[PDB]
């Protein structure tokens, strides 16, 4: 699978509280984390489906 899928979730420097999905390689599944609101990395999805399709 793509390399960015193996990277840990990146909250970013912004301080909003936005729930996003990321692929957790360790558990082999997509879960949620708190995204700050800016400068997102690729392992950041607005839905579980998009996450599973891209990183599954």
């Amino acid at each position: 699978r793509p390399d960015f899928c193996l990277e840990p979730p990146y909250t970013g420097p912004c301080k909003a509280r936005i729930i996003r999905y990321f692929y957790n390689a360790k558990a082999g599944l997509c879960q949620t984390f708190v995204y700050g609101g800016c400068r997102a990395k690729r392992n950041n999805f607005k839905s579980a489906e998009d996450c599973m399709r891209t990183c599954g």
Binding site: C14, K15, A16, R17, I19, V34, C38
Partner: protein
């Protein structure tokens, strides 16, 4: 808010919560129909909650009002976070009382060393996650621009100001964005960004409100 304390119930009447299903940002009421927040808190649909203390329990003093217009600063930069400010016009004027009040716009730019009050319902831990039910408060000073630039080499613009402590321990965090930094009764800053939370040598960075008073007033008078 990391390292702060629970605010006295309704001692921060100008604080509001931005909600789109759940609390995601803070804001400040500047007049009966307008709220100021951070541009990165932008959402197409937003409900403003005022008179809040315990964000998860219906207390009876709250007012729920939908946003009618959302206006971000035209020069906001999603990458550098320069001009991180946004105005929200409410669908209808709110009722002003002891629990819901406005905060004044700055008369001038406050000097470094000025003690301020920061508030919000954001994360309370530097490592891990703990979202509080009750509004948190933090007393912190405006830092010299030189120390701000030293902490964030080449990332600070004239529209930003650092507030907090270089030793870390106390700071704003995720969930606090858009919130108020009030000094001597005036809104001098808006919670914006930072590297991590309460980390040494990385105090929070805030939007310097005094540079936008005219834009705010002109925007409100035109909409």
């Amino acid at each position: 808010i990391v390292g702060g304390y629970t605010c006295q119930e309704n001692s921060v009447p100008y604080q509001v919560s931005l909600n789109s299903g759940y609390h995601f940002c803070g804001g400040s009421l500047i007049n009966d129909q307008w709220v100021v927040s951070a541009a990165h808190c932008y959402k197409s649909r937003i409900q403003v909650r005022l008179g809040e203390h315990n964000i998860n329990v219906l207390e009876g003093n709250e007012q729920f009002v939908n946003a009618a217009k959302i206006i971000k600063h035209p020069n906001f930069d999603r990458k550098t976070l320069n001009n991180d400010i946004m105005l929200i016009k409410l669908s209808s004027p709110v009722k002003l009382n002891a629990r819901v009040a406005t905060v004044a716009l700055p008369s001038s730019c406050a000097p470094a060393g000025t003690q301020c009050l920061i508030s919000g319902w954001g994360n309370t831990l530097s490592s891990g996650v703990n979202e509080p039910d009750l509004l948190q408060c933090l007393d912190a000073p405006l830092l010299p621009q030189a120390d701000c630039e030293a902490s964030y080499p080449g990332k600070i613009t004239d529209n930003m100001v650092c507030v907090g402590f270089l030793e870390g321990g106390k700071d704003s965090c995720q969930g606090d964005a858009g919130g108020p930094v009030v000094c001597n009764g005036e809104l001098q800053g808006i919670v914006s960004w930072g590297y991590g939370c309460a980390l040494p040598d990385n105090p929070g960075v805030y939007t310097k409100v005094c540079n936008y008073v005219d834009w705010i007033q002109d925007t409100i008078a035109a909409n």
